[PDB]
Design a protein around this ligand. Sequence first.
Ligand SMILES: [Zn+2]
Lengths: 146, 157, 59, 156, 73
Amino acid sequence: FREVVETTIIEGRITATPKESPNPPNPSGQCPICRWNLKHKYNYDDVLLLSQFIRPHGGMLPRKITGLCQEEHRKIEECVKMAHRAGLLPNHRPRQLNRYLTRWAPGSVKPIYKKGPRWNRVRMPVGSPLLRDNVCYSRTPWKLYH
Amino acid sequence: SKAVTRHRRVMHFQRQKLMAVTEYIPPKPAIHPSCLPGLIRLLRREIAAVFQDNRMIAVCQNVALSAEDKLLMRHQLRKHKILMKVFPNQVLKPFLEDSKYQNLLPLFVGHNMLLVSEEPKVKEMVRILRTVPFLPLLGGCIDDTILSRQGFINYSK
Amino acid sequence: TMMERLHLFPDEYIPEDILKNLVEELPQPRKIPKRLDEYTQEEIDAFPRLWTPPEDYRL
Amino acid sequence: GYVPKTSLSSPPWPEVVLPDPVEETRHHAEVVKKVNEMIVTGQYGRLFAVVHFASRQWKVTSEDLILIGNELDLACGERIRLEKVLLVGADNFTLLGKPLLGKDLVRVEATVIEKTESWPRIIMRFRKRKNFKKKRIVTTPQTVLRINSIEIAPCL
Amino acid sequence: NCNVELALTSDGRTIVCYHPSVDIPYEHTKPIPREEGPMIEQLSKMFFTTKHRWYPHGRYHRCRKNLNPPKDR
RNA sequence: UAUCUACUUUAUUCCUCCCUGUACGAAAGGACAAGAGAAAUAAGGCCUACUUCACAAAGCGCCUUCUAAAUGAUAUCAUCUCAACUUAAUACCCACACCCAAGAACAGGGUU
RNA sequence: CCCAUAGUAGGCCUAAAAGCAGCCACCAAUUAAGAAAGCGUUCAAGCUCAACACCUCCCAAACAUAUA
Ligand SMILES: [Zn+2]
């Protein structure tokens, strides 16, 4: 990438830019996700991909740079949120209750003071509906609402 | 309860099982398709006649002038036979590549103003472009030879 | 009575009179995930890195 | 074809390969042979046997008693070869059939101890406010069998 | 714990399972080392039961309890 | 004439002064907060005085009452962020018999 | 995101109502800004759009990963 080094002299210097890995097993895709057979094969667990696709301060890169499709760009967005709040990204800081699979920001969720009757119960959302299309290695499907 | 009610009437449970079983299942594609791979001719003719019209070309940086200021500069440039021309650069690159302008390709991008003429009077444009402390005279080309800005000064002198 | 058979402790600290009775340490039901810190070099090297960053981008 | 090491890439269940049937049937042959030697050399203590008698399966060993809820059409004291053995095991080995063991391989032999009836059982029906009250007293016939012997033959 | 040997017989009608006992290794072993309310509280804490089990019952329940119950084995 | 359930010791408000007729606004206008008062109610107690009154119980009497800022990506500006982060209950209670400020009985306190 | 000159303060009636009080034409310039699409003024002046140029007190407890 490039860096803006200032000291008053200020300059922009390009340093240490990577490239593709030597082989994609399924080339001729449009996105790296579609090119490495990861269309429906990641989660919030794996912070390898999620570490690749983010800025060093926890933000993402725009889709015009990474070349992702819209579907898995939104999926990577939600997985960044789910992995940051679960505490899986401790080195991408701006400068205590344990969680995982947190869809919404924990600062702006109202408690369910009155859950409804058995036919109108207000459920607790777990996981995200963007990851609904994952590969189903479980006999019963994901329960996204608890 | 009548069969036509103001509110939605609750179906008998067998009928609701029918409405659930018979529900429309849309076809799932195997691979998702998003992840699968006269005016322009008039401009071609016009800037072509411009290109075999002029002998030397100078270009400028004109979006940074007011409406009244562009009116005045048009006024003091009207006393000459020179014409001004601005047009999009995404069609100007085919014009530069078509006129074998290899050394004019990395010159005409962004906001630029063309100053087509056939005889030298760039001296008084230098005079009136020291009167405003901006808007440099960009590099041009006389008879397939690139004119730099120091070349513009030498050609003016 | 079943609830009185069960003993809960909030920390790593367990009293000695209960640590002398345990037999089996039950496996944790949830697969614990691990961060960037607990990744070794061989794990991130064995993972292929996927894409071309543009040479001129500020981050 | 290639997917890198990722959480949903590999299955959560551990990979297992089943051996190809050649050395597996060699292993089966040596195991059956060696169990046959244990049978013929008397390497068993007492035997247990799951036996499908009248309509239900019994975990039958030697020297013991069974209650059966019907007439068996036998006078007391005659012996019986209970067919439909369907599991026979010892301290070290078991033999279970598909779904039965052959009559040349297991001999389970029982004696008829007694021919009683059950205690008087109550069948009472009662629907309220409909004056519905019926009462019946039943005594079901029963026979108790003494399993005598469960012996085995070395035919494998 | 898992180590047994299964084998289908030759004609394939019976399943012969072989299962000896696993003996505990010597190296996996250790050597042998050589009022009324407070009473209910102490017994409850010592046996990890509630208090309610330790209070006595009335005479009616003490009399219905069978004194020579049928014993099997 | 109460048989059964249930149950029988879980600090506010007004007005006055000060701050201040300050800040605020530009003049008119006009703060908060905190503090000092004077009251009233409620709760919890008490008899030195007053009053009903007298080995004491009372009140009209007295005492006490503690959601918001920056930073920032997706969408390189910006953006409070169902984006990541950073920052802004103590107390109370606890070992015969006679008299009692204890009390329906039982209990409880004292009996040097 | 930009970017907003000029025939013109289009005529008619209207104190003047100018693109914006109303009728009718809605031509035309550079390369292109509509005799005019929303604030806005008695009216104006100023502002945004397009287009040019970058593009009574809730109520089972719970659980998203092990092969129908
Ligand atoms: Zn794709």
